[PDB]
Design an enzyme around this catalytic site. Structure first.
Site, PDB file in Angstrom:
ATOM      1  N   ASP A  43       1.612   7.612   6.870  1.00  0.00           N
ATOM      2  CA  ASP A  43       1.946   6.204   6.793  1.00  0.00           C
ATOM      3  C   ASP A  43       2.080   5.471   8.107  1.00  0.00           C
ATOM      4  OD1 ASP A  43       4.359   4.909   4.356  1.00  0.00           O
ATOM      5  OD2 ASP A  43       2.342   4.253   4.898  1.00  0.00           O
ATOM      6  N   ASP A  44       1.734   4.186   8.073  1.00  0.00           N
ATOM      7  CA  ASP A  44       1.676   3.371   9.275  1.00  0.00           C
ATOM      8  C   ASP A  44       0.870   4.051  10.366  1.00  0.00           C
ATOM      9  OD1 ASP A  44       3.132   1.409   8.025  1.00  0.00           O
ATOM     10  OD2 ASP A  44       5.045   1.929   8.973  1.00  0.00           O
ATOM     11  N   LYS A  65       0.844  -1.183   0.000  1.00  0.00           N
ATOM     12  CA  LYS A  65       0.000   0.000   0.000  1.00  0.00           C
ATOM     13  C   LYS A  65       0.889   1.247   0.000  1.00  0.00           C
ATOM     14  CE  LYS A  65       0.274  -0.044   4.889  1.00  0.00           C
ATOM     15  NZ  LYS A  65       1.578  -0.607   4.359  1.00  0.00           N
ATOM     16  N   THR A  66       1.971   1.220   0.778  1.00  0.00           N
ATOM     17  CA  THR A  66       2.875   2.360   0.890  1.00  0.00           C
ATOM     18  C   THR A  66       3.681   2.658  -0.366  1.00  0.00           C
ATOM     19  OG1 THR A  66       3.185   2.102   3.285  1.00  0.00           O
ATOM     20  CG2 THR A  66       4.932   3.209   2.059  1.00  0.00           C
ATOM     21  N   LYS A 112       4.965  -7.449  -0.425  1.00  0.00           N
ATOM     22  CA  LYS A 112       6.183  -7.193   0.354  1.00  0.00           C
ATOM     23  C   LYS A 112       6.737  -8.521   0.880  1.00  0.00           C
ATOM     24  CE  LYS A 112       8.407  -3.888   2.881  1.00  0.00           C
ATOM     25  NZ  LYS A 112       8.500  -2.435   2.560  1.00  0.00           N
ATOM     26  N   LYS A 146     -10.586  17.620   9.657  1.00  0.00           N
ATOM     27  CA  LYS A 146     -11.595  18.654   9.848  1.00  0.00           C
ATOM     28  C   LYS A 146     -10.955  20.028   9.639  1.00  0.00           C
ATOM     29  CE  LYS A 146     -15.977  17.668  11.040  1.00  0.00           C
ATOM     30  NZ  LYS A 146     -17.190  18.508  11.168  1.00  0.00           N
TER      31      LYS A 146
HETATM   32  N1  LIG Z   1       3.227   0.013  -6.666  1.00  0.00           N
HETATM   33  C1  LIG Z   1       3.985  -0.611  -5.764  1.00  0.00           C
HETATM   34  N2  LIG Z   1       3.720  -0.221  -4.497  1.00  0.00           N
HETATM   35  C2  LIG Z   1       4.335  -0.718  -3.422  1.00  0.00           C
HETATM   36  N3  LIG Z   1       5.234  -1.687  -3.546  1.00  0.00           N
HETATM   37  C3  LIG Z   1       5.596  -2.201  -4.741  1.00  0.00           C
HETATM   38  C4  LIG Z   1       4.993  -1.721  -5.997  1.00  0.00           C
HETATM   39  N4  LIG Z   1       5.612  -2.452  -7.003  1.00  0.00           N
HETATM   40  C5  LIG Z   1       6.475  -3.313  -6.392  1.00  0.00           C
HETATM   41  N5  LIG Z   1       6.474  -3.133  -5.054  1.00  0.00           N
HETATM   42  C6  LIG Z   1       7.236  -3.863  -4.017  1.00  0.00           C
HETATM   43  O1  LIG Z   1       6.226  -4.404  -3.143  1.00  0.00           O
HETATM   44  C7  LIG Z   1       6.632  -4.324  -1.770  1.00  0.00           C
HETATM   45  C8  LIG Z   1       5.945  -3.169  -1.044  1.00  0.00           C
HETATM   46  O2  LIG Z   1       5.349  -3.524   0.200  1.00  0.00           O
HETATM   47  P1  LIG Z   1       5.484  -2.514   1.446  1.00  0.00           P
HETATM   48  O3  LIG Z   1       6.246  -3.257   2.522  1.00  0.00           O
HETATM   49  O4  LIG Z   1       6.013  -1.200   0.924  1.00  0.00           O
HETATM   50  O5  LIG Z   1       3.979  -2.249   1.948  1.00  0.00           O
HETATM   51  P2  LIG Z   1       3.738  -1.804   3.477  1.00  0.00           P
HETATM   52  O6  LIG Z   1       2.598  -0.820   3.581  1.00  0.00           O
HETATM   53  O7  LIG Z   1       5.067  -1.447   4.099  1.00  0.00           O
HETATM   54  O8  LIG Z   1       3.214  -3.165   4.143  1.00  0.00           O
HETATM   55  P3  LIG Z   1       3.275  -3.274   5.742  1.00  0.00           P
HETATM   56  O9  LIG Z   1       3.084  -1.846   6.191  1.00  0.00           O
HETATM   57  O10 LIG Z   1       2.127  -4.177   6.096  1.00  0.00           O
HETATM   58  O11 LIG Z   1       4.639  -3.861   6.005  1.00  0.00           O
HETATM   59  C9  LIG Z   1       8.103  -4.027  -1.871  1.00  0.00           C
HETATM   60  O12 LIG Z   1       8.743  -5.266  -2.224  1.00  0.00           O
HETATM   61  C10 LIG Z   1       8.091  -3.064  -3.040  1.00  0.00           C
HETATM   62  O13 LIG Z   1       9.413  -2.758  -3.487  1.00  0.00           O
HETATM   63  N1  LIG Z   2     -27.851  23.815   3.834  1.00  0.00           N
HETATM   64  C1  LIG Z   2     -26.686  23.861   4.549  1.00  0.00           C
HETATM   65  N2  LIG Z   2     -26.668  24.002   5.898  1.00  0.00           N
HETATM   66  C2  LIG Z   2     -25.511  24.044   6.593  1.00  0.00           C
HETATM   67  N3  LIG Z   2     -24.289  23.953   6.033  1.00  0.00           N
HETATM   68  C3  LIG Z   2     -24.151  23.812   4.692  1.00  0.00           C
HETATM   69  C4  LIG Z   2     -25.370  23.755   3.873  1.00  0.00           C
HETATM   70  N4  LIG Z   2     -24.976  23.609   2.594  1.00  0.00           N
HETATM   71  C5  LIG Z   2     -23.631  23.576   2.582  1.00  0.00           C
HETATM   72  N5  LIG Z   2     -23.139  23.687   3.825  1.00  0.00           N
HETATM   73  C6  LIG Z   2     -21.683  23.680   4.074  1.00  0.00           C
HETATM   74  O1  LIG Z   2     -21.214  22.374   4.424  1.00  0.00           O
HETATM   75  C7  LIG Z   2     -19.965  22.540   5.093  1.00  0.00           C
HETATM   76  C8  LIG Z   2     -20.041  21.865   6.456  1.00  0.00           C
HETATM   77  O2  LIG Z   2     -19.165  22.558   7.335  1.00  0.00           O
HETATM   78  P1  LIG Z   2     -19.013  22.184   8.890  1.00  0.00           P
HETATM   79  O3  LIG Z   2     -17.662  21.553   9.131  1.00  0.00           O
HETATM   80  O4  LIG Z   2     -19.411  23.414   9.670  1.00  0.00           O
HETATM   81  O5  LIG Z   2     -20.107  21.043   9.197  1.00  0.00           O
HETATM   82  P2  LIG Z   2     -20.067  20.387  10.669  1.00  0.00           P
HETATM   83  O6  LIG Z   2     -21.414  19.831  11.058  1.00  0.00           O
HETATM   84  O7  LIG Z   2     -19.385  21.398  11.566  1.00  0.00           O
HETATM   85  O8  LIG Z   2     -19.152  19.084  10.457  1.00  0.00           O
HETATM   86  P3  LIG Z   2     -18.888  18.092  11.698  1.00  0.00           P
HETATM   87  O9  LIG Z   2     -20.145  17.262  11.783  1.00  0.00           O
HETATM   88  O10 LIG Z   2     -17.662  17.307  11.298  1.00  0.00           O
HETATM   89  O11 LIG Z   2     -18.707  19.018  12.875  1.00  0.00           O
HETATM   90  C9  LIG Z   2     -19.754  24.048   5.193  1.00  0.00           C
HETATM   91  O12 LIG Z   2     -19.065  24.491   4.008  1.00  0.00           O
HETATM   92  C10 LIG Z   2     -21.165  24.589   5.170  1.00  0.00           C
HETATM   93  O13 LIG Z   2     -21.212  25.970   4.808  1.00  0.00           O
END
Ligand SMILES: Nc1ncnc2c1ncn2[C@@H]1O[C@H](COP(=O)(O)OP(=O)(O)OP(=O)(O)O)[C@@H](O)[C@H]1O
Ligand SMILES: Nc1ncnc2c1ncn2[C@@H]1O[C@H](COP(=O)(O)OP(=O)(O)OP(=O)(O)O)[C@@H](O)[C@H]1O
Ligand SMILES: Nc1ncnc2c1ncn2[C@@H]1O[C@H](COP(=O)(O)OP(=O)(O)OP(=O)(O)O)[C@@H](O)[C@H]1O
Lengths: 482, 466
Positions: free
Chosen positions: A348-349, A294-295, A453, A376
């Site tokens: 990561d991690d 994934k990384t 990996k 947030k």
């Molecule tokens: N797109 C790609 N992304 C990641 N790794 C790749 C890719 N292509 C080949 N590899 C190889 O795959 C392995 C990557 O696994 P990696 O350990 O980075 O994941 P990870 O998130 O660290 O897993 P964990 O956190 O569970 O150990 C390595 O051998 C890396 O060089």
């Molecule tokens: N009809 C609506 N009423 C209220 N907010 C709206 C509406 N339409 C769009 N929005 C927008 O949606 C976004 C939500 O922002 P905000 O983080 O304040 O929500 P929140 O309830 O505080 O989130 P959380 O539940 O994580 O606290 C803002 O951009 C707000 O202006």
């Protein structure tokens, strides 16, 4: 208009503000009715080549001041005494000024490496009690913070200028002058390209450039008894200032259709970022089995996006830090993300980042809070950021309301197919073509559950034993791993 | 009684305490049998229009002192010398007084922008050995901590008074003179507005104003040769009557709070399940109030803080609210301030106490304040016993009908008539349940797909957030 690489916008403005008010002849100033600036100060990171700029600027301002140089110690000589001296270099200028004051005398004084008596003495001479104008003083220093507050205030040193490390285009300008000097004489290296050098270096202070080129000249000297520039790139810095090559040791091999679906989806996410006016902040997470790869994928997504600022955040750096300290470094990374209008950050991690442990469960609350608030938390309007999280374990994350936070969730499952595994094997290219056939024969009718990996490690483990052994050992090992 | 805008209360008390005991003629000091105050000291923030105030006080004290001005350096000339000067300006006042000591001479000396021998030397001049009374010196300064310890104690400078945070009006006045000078000259900038300039800057010292002006002159020269909006970038839609109704109820709370003496405090609680937009609704509620001081506190501002530090921030904001006659305070991410985590439980108790206690707490009499909070988990909050503390409960819900959905898609205006015609054909009659912000998100997630994959991707998302 020569010679100074980069710093043309900055140069133009600074030049204009200090020099233009002096230059207009002669009614313009009275019409403005504004007193001439007392001094200009530039503070830069070391190696930014401040001194050459100051000499050049002083030279540019007057046919001849002619330049006054002050030693760094300044206050050397105990008996009386030094204080009187600090008074004295100003004193010559003031004497000239009393003698001719109105028009037209200009004196340029520069202070290098700018307590008790000297603070007051200098401060008094530069401004007040009466006049003391018709002269300017420039101070060059590595750090702004070190310097006194009183000078900073508008007046004696109204304007303070900060010099950024040279831009890629600017870097091209500094390299360009030395290269050009080499260009004019016949000898040159054909292999070296200006554009290539510029693209290669982002970080370097000026100094770094002249130094690398000079070093290349030395290597060339050695040759007589890319090229040299390439060798300098190989060694010379010492730059003092994002490596994906440390996070993609192993290649985004196209083992599977899943790989493609995750990446195309990554393209959808970058595209999603590109505008996103309605929603400012982008949150994405990856949930995978351990050894998921994934990384590697996340690092690749960050490289593919190429947003102006992309910086990896690492668990490895955090280790052994106080939990509060861990938070602090992390917050610091978060603010660093703010500067780019469009920006990407990597988490990561996260299970590891949290310091989460399965027993208890026992975990670090403060880190979790920083993480929880930032998604947030809103970057200032305009500037935007995209967040990537890699998690080994999904359920706990769902559990801490972390899943709720993320805008999108993606899965990167271990291959369940023997043939895909075979394809991956072909991509890695480690075992011989007979072996490819044997493995292909074995996989059918069998189901494989292994991380990439883990898979690379497995292949590598099977390989060291002798050729008859490798097929059997690897199959048995797979069976055990299953 | 002129001229100083605001600072009538501080002014009234200060003038009276320093001036009244001296002013009363003549049996009064003896009848009181109290020694005349030696000096009065004021400490203030930058941009407070300090010089004028000092001038006014000095002028007010005597027909003519006549005013003594002390240069900022004060001690310049190390060799003898300065010591003689610091002793000497005092010395003159002492000379007049010794010459006539009994009655009735007062001399006023003021030192602007405030160690070794000088510490003792000043203390000696202000007090002792014998007398040294019949004169006053006032020191006005930007930071309290820098100045000397010997001084604070009752006696030499017995009373120290702090001016309240600087009125913009004065800043507007200092800017106003320079602007006036440009007005006065034919040349001027249409773009500069006194009101705009005053409103943009708060922190700045006087000095700063003439400095900004010098910079403006330089720009012209180059030519010749706490936010409400940021917090709610989206703005507010009105898809449903409940949505309107929360603003009306909130407005009613404000009305109650401002109008009625009987309850100093009302607590506003919003009940929603995240990702609800309620936080925004609460900020809006605050905006409608048009209260004199309204401050919205953000957890991120507090991010990474130790428990104690968060609590200190809370104390500061809330204390800031106390000084005003009335205010609206909006509290956000109430769970996060708490640091509740469902696992555990893990939470920071100390903060819970500080908030909960303060919530019960009321400002000193003659002032009232309004508190608004956003809660993820009304059930969990009630479980704490904190919800009981809050005065009122208001609930904001996620959309439930297909109809509220189209009304919202319409008010936002993102999808086409065609788009909305297909969506309605896929939701009308069915049951939905999605908060506002994720919707605003999904919208963006659908515009990323081609013009024909937008409907399907949208319906796919709504199919997932179920
Ligand atoms: N797109 C790609 N992304 C990641 N790794 C790749 C890719 N292509 C080949 N590899 C190889 O795959 C392995 C990557 O696994 P990696 O350990 O980075 O994941 P990870 O998130 O660290 O897993 P964990 O956190 O569970 O150990 C390595 O051998 C890396 O060089
Ligand atoms: N009809 C609506 N009423 C209220 N907010 C709206 C509406 N339409 C769009 N929005 C927008 O949606 C976004 C939500 O922002 P905000 O983080 O304040 O929500 P929140 O309830 O505080 O989130 P959380 O539940 O994580 O606290 C803002 O951009 C707000 O202006
Ligand atoms: N961008 C640049 N422009 C001009 N000169 C540069 C630049 N980068 C490095 N230099 C080199 O630095 C010298 C002048 O800058 P200098 O290194 O003196 O700045 P500085 O701030 O004094 O550095 P330090 O603080 O390390 O002494 C020149 O000899 C030049 O070779």
């Amino acid at each position: 208009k020569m010679g100074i690489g980069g710093l043309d916008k900055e140069f133009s403005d600074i030049f204009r503000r200090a020099f233009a008010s002096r230059v207009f002849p002669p009614e313009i100033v009275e019409q403005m009715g504004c007193k001439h600036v007392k001094g200009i100060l530039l503070y830069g990171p070391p190696g930014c080549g401040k001194t050459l700029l100051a000499r050049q600027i002083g030279k540019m301002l007057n046919a001849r001041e002619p330049k006054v140089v002050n030693g760094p110690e300044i206050l050397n000589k105990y008996v009386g005494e030094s204080e009187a001296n600090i008074r004295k270099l100003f004193a010559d200028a003031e004497e000239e000024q009393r003698r001719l004051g109105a028009n037209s005398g200009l004196h340029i004084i520069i202070f290098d490496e700018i307590h008790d008596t000297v603070v007051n003495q200098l401060l008094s001479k530069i401004d007040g009690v009466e006049q003391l104008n018709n002269i300017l003083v420039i101070g060059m220093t590595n750090r702004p913070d070190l310097i006194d507050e009183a000078l900073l205030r508008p007046g004696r040193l109204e304007v303070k200028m900060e010099i950024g490390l040279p831009d890629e285009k600017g870097r091209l300008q500094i390299l360009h002058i030395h290269t050009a000097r080499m260009r004019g004489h016949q000898l040159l290296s054909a292999d070296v390209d200006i554009k290539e050098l510029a693209v290669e270096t982002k970080n370097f202070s000026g100094a770094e450039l002249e130094g690398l080129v000079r070093a290349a000249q030395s290597t060339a000297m050695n040759r007589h008894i890319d090229f040299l520039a390439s060798l300098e790139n190989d060694i010379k810095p010492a730059f003092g200032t994002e490596d994906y090559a440390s996070y993609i040791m192993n290649g985004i091999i196209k083992w599977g259709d899943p790989v493609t679906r995750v990446l195309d989806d990554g393209e959808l996410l970058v595209q999603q970022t590109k505008n996103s006016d309605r929603t400012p902040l982008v949150s994405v997470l990856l949930e995978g089995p351990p050894h998921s790869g994934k990384t590697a994928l996340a690092a690749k997504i960050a490289e593919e996006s190429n947003f102006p600022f992309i910086k990896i955040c690492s668990p490895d750096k955090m280790i052994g830090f106080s939990e509060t300290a861990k938070c602090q470094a992390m917050k610091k990374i978060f603010d660093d993300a703010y500067k780019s209008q469009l920006s990407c950050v990597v988490v990561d991690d996260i299970e590891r980042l949290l310091d989460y442990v399965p027993i208890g469960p026992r975990f670090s609350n403060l880190v979790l809070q920083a993480l929880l608030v930032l998604l947030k938390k809103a970057p200032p309007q305009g500037r935007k950021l995209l967040i990537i999280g890699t998690t080994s374990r999904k359920d706990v994350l769902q559990e801490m309301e972390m899943l709720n936070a993320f805008s999108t969730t993606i899965h990167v499952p271990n291959i369940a197919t023997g043939e895909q595994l075979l394809e991956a094997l072909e991509l890695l290219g480690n075992f011989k073509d007979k072996e490819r056939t044997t493995i292909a024969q074995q996989v059918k009718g069998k189901k494989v559950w292994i991380g990439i990996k883990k898979l690379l490690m497995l292949i590598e483990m099977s390989l060291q034993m002798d050729p008859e052994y490798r097929v059997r050992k690897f199959l048995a090992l797979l069976r055990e791993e299953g």
